Design a protein around this ligand. Structure first.
Ligand SMILES: OC[C@H]1O[C@H](O[C@H]2[C@H](O)[C@@H](O)[C@@H](O[C@H]3[C@H](O)[C@@H](O)[C@@H](O[C@H]4[C@H](O)[C@@H](O)[C@@H](O)O[C@@H]4CO)O[C@@H]3CO)O[C@@H]2CO)[C@H](O)[C@@H](O)[C@@H]1O
Ligand SMILES: OC[C@H]1O[C@H](O[C@H]2[C@H](O)[C@@H](O)[C@@H](O)O[C@@H]2CO)[C@H](O)[C@@H](O)[C@@H]1O
Ligand SMILES: OC[C@H]1O[C@H](O[C@H]2[C@H](O)[C@@H](O)[C@@H](O)O[C@@H]2CO)[C@H](O)[C@@H](O)[C@@H]1O
Ligand SMILES: OC[C@H]1O[C@H](O[C@H]2[C@H](O)[C@@H](O)[C@@H](O)O[C@@H]2CO)[C@H](O)[C@@H](O)[C@@H]1O
Ligand SMILES: [Ca+2]
Ligand SMILES: [Ca+2]
Length: 686
């Protein structure tokens, strides 16, 4: 299969995701609707169930609404069984229509459907070339009060009908009892409750094993991807061990939610996207796009800076999931605003790097404030809007023009209101022109591109007042006027002759797992794949075609490797870096070091004998460690993903900038568990 096939669960860069709030999309089966005070068929009360389900989605996939738009993946509400209590929050009744108040990760939410409905959903989708992504929220169960056990369902957790435990009298310690977070620090937001949601303790073996088992059930059901909720709120080491469990079993594209506010740029966010095994929802991209096209609080130079910066900060910028709004933000379109603003933002997002996600109803110009006004029932299924048509014209380009799916991004012309950029990959180019100024045209002169000489029709066909482009020799375009609110797309595609790698997935796995390398120019006869200097050819390369290669990871030492391929003729490709070969299956272990006093700005880190611990390289040490919540300074702690059942030697160190002070004595040593978790407690050696 080619890189663009629905069967490619490892790469979403050529796809366009449509985010659906199941309950608010389409009620296809009135029989599973909740009843009484938990239900509102008119969907006037936005905190109750409106009746949307999997049957409805199946209906809209079959009647051509989604396929007509050019959507190729759908991301749906968390499918697991949620609590049944109607929660009164100071006067207002609330239900779990949203899917985020889990009670049992091994069963379905009956309001959405049965497991049979779920399987039918996967089948209907796959039959129409649409991938299915599910929301998954393992940070907590539901709202609980440890002293008012009668409140809601007391955050109760079930294992396929069997009561594991509740928030009140949690003697097993399945949850955290550290209070509620004030979001003051990253550590504070991880080990304390989010609002009143019972926080799961991932250091408890029962919880650890349970979640890893639960996700395997869904993988077996045929899902194509996972959206991980609240990743900034779970231990990073545990999450890596969780991603390893998925990748070492049945890898699927996974991306997490790490909220970023306006103008916020987080280095922790970057590190997590670069090292956890999963990518993230591109909040930096979204906040900036809103500032520029929506609220007008920044201009084109700020958009450019975000594009150049992110391309530098994220090791895999093409895996970040882009959007302009979602269920936790005001809808992009304001009731009174000019529609062209939304249309332009859509066009920009659809032709920009990364994986575009569209929140249901956007194409219908839905408006609404914060939760729950941003979650109204979709008003209609009309294919006659300009927004629907823009998506319909642009979504398909991600499949047919690799420059859009995998290309670099380059600014070719810019002012306060205008941005003209070029996407390029192999012998493929796309040039996009956007003039956010709704009142003034702009005179474009001096535009240079990589387009071959000739004339180019606007791919949008003038839908957004775009025009034809005339390119002379040297790729120099003749002067032209870019209309007020104008948006135009020009492109050129041709066969690529040299092997060019555009994507690799998964990005982290143990030896033996099969990875997918996507790109162009691979040729049709098997060549060679290199992991560092190690060559792999013949049988281990399970499939080889011009746009996709499937190969098993060789048994090399755990570590970071560059990947390169060479065609049958010996021609080598570009290098794709940052691939992590694990030392084996993983387990999450908590390391604790006592009496490690430091000076201000100086932090404690951990290093050791395996690649998962940096292999004694201080530049690769794990940390900085925590010392507020679970243990307090001068005792430090941290949850780390380490190879299961191995005997490891470790040492702690203090780092200030790049200046390091090693622990004295001999290495500490220990053997990792084969499964479940463990906690290692040692004293700092002077
Ligand atoms: O009654 C419980 C509520 O639970 C549900 O909330 C979900 C969201 O829908 C998820 O998408 C996600 O969103 C969180 C986000 O994970 C979290 O970081 C937080 O964001 C903070 C941010 O960290 C901080 O830097 C600052 O910018 O403020 C942000 C506020 O958004 O909040 C998001 C929104 O909840 O996770 C939570 C729970 O996992 C559900 O939506 C609600 O209807 C329900 O009330
Ligand atoms: O001509 C090459 C030149 O093109 C662009 O420069 C534009 C500039 O962005 C506009 O604001 C205006 O000043 O016209 C110039 C065209 O002469 C690129 O921005 C620039 O990097 C490049 O050299
Ligand atoms: O909370 C993290 C904090 O840890 C270290 O700060 C110590 C500091 O070194 C000690 O001298 C003492 O003052 O207590 C602090 C912990 O409360 C790091 O120095 C610091 O950068 C970091 O924020
Ligand atoms: O370079 C690998 C080496 O690193 C560690 O050695 C530390 C040592 O513990 C310190 O006391 C200090 O002398 O710096 C050394 C770094 O060179 C490991 O302890 C050791 O096993 C390993 O070989
Ligand atoms: Ca229903
Ligand atoms: Ca947590």
């Amino acid at each position: 299969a080619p890189d663009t096939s629905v069967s490619n669960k490892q790469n979403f860069s050529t796809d366009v995701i449509y985010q659906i709030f199941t309950d608010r999309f389409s009620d296809g089966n009135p029989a599973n609707n909740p009843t009484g005070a938990a239900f509102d068929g008119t969907c006037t009360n936005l905190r109750l169930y409106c009746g949307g389900d999997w049957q409805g989605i199946i209906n809209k996939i079959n009647d051509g609404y989604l396929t007509g738009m050019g959507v190729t993946a759908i991301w749906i509400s968390q499918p697991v069984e949620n609590i049944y209590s109607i929660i009164n929050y100071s006067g207002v009744n609330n239900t779990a229509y949203h899917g985020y108040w889990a009670r049992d990760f091994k069963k379905t939410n009956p309001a959405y459907g049965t497991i049979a409905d779920f399987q039918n959903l996967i089948a209907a989708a796959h039959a129409k070339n649409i991938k299915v992504i599910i929301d998954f929220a393992p940070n907590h169960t539901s709202p609980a009060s440890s002293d008012q056990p009668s409140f809601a369902e007391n955050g109760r957790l079930y294992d396929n009908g069997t009561l594991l435990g509740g928030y009140t009298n949690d003697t097993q310690n399945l949850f955290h009892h550290n209070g509620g977070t004030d979001f003051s620090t990253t550590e504070n937001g991880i080990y304390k409750n989010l609002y009143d949601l019972a926080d799961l303790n991932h250091n408890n073996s029962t919880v650890d094993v349970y979640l890893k088992d639960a996700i395997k059930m869904w993988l077996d059901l045929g899902i194509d991807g996972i959206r991980m909720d609240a990743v900034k709120h779970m231990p990073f080491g545990w999450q890596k061990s969780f991603m390893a469990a998925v990748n070492n079993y049945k890898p699927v594209f996974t991306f997490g939610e790490w909220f970023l506010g306006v103008n916020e740029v987080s280095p922790e966010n970057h590190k997590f996207a670069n090292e956890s095994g999963m990518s993230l929802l591109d909040f930096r991209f979204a906040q900036k796009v809103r500032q520029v096209f929506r609220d007008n609080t920044d201009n084109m130079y700020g958009l450019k800076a975000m594009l150049e910066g992110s391309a530098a900060d994220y090791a895999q910028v093409d895996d970040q999931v882009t959007f302009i709004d979602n269920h936790d933000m005001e809808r992009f379109h304001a009731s009174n605003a000019n529609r062209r603003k939304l249309e332009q933002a859509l066009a920009f997002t659809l032709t920009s790097r990364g994986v575009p996600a569209i929140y249901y109803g956007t194409e219908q110009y839905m408006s609404g404030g914060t939760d729950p006004d941003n979650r109204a029932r979709i008003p209609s299924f009309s294919t006659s809007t300009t927004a629907y048509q823009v998506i319909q014209k642009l979504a398909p380009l991600r499949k047919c023009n690799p420059a859009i799916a995998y290309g670099s991004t380059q600014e070719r012309w810019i002012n306060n209101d205008v941005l003209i950029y070029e996407r390029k990959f192999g012998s493929n180019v796309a040039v996009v022109a956007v003039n956010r100024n709704l009142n003034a045209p702009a005179s474009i002169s001096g535009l240079v591109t990589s387009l071959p000489q000739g004339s180019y029709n606007d791919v949008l066909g003038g839908l957004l007042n775009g025009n034809t482009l005339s390119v002379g020799s040297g790729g120099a375009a003749s002067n032209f006027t870019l209309a007020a609110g104008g948006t135009a797309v020009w492109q050129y595609t041709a066969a690529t002759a040299t092997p060019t790698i555009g994507h690799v997935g998964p990005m982290m796995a143990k030896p033996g797992v099969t990875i997918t390398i996507d790109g162009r120019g691979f040729g049709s006869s098997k060549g060679t794949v290199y992991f560092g200097t190690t060559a792999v050819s013949g049988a281990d390369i399970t499939s080889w075609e011009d746009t996709q290669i499937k190969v098993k990871i060789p048994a090399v030492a755990g570590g970071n490797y560059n990947i390169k391929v060479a065609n049958a003729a010996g021609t080598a490709s570009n290098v794709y870096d940052n691939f992590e070969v694990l030392s084996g299956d993983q387990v999450s272990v908590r390391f604790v070091v006592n009496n490690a006093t430091t000076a201000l700005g100086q932090n404690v880190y951990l290093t050791g004998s395996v690649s998962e611990l940096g292999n004694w390289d201080p530049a690769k040490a794990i940390g900085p460690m925590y010392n507020q919540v679970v243990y307090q300074y001068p005792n430090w702690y941290y949850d780390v993903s380490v190879p299961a059942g191995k005997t490891i030697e470790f040492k702690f160190l203090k780092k200030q900038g790049s200046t390091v002070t090693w622990e004295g004595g001999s290495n500490h040593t220990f053997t990792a568990p084969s499964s479940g978790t463990a906690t290692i407690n040692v004293n700092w050696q002077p």
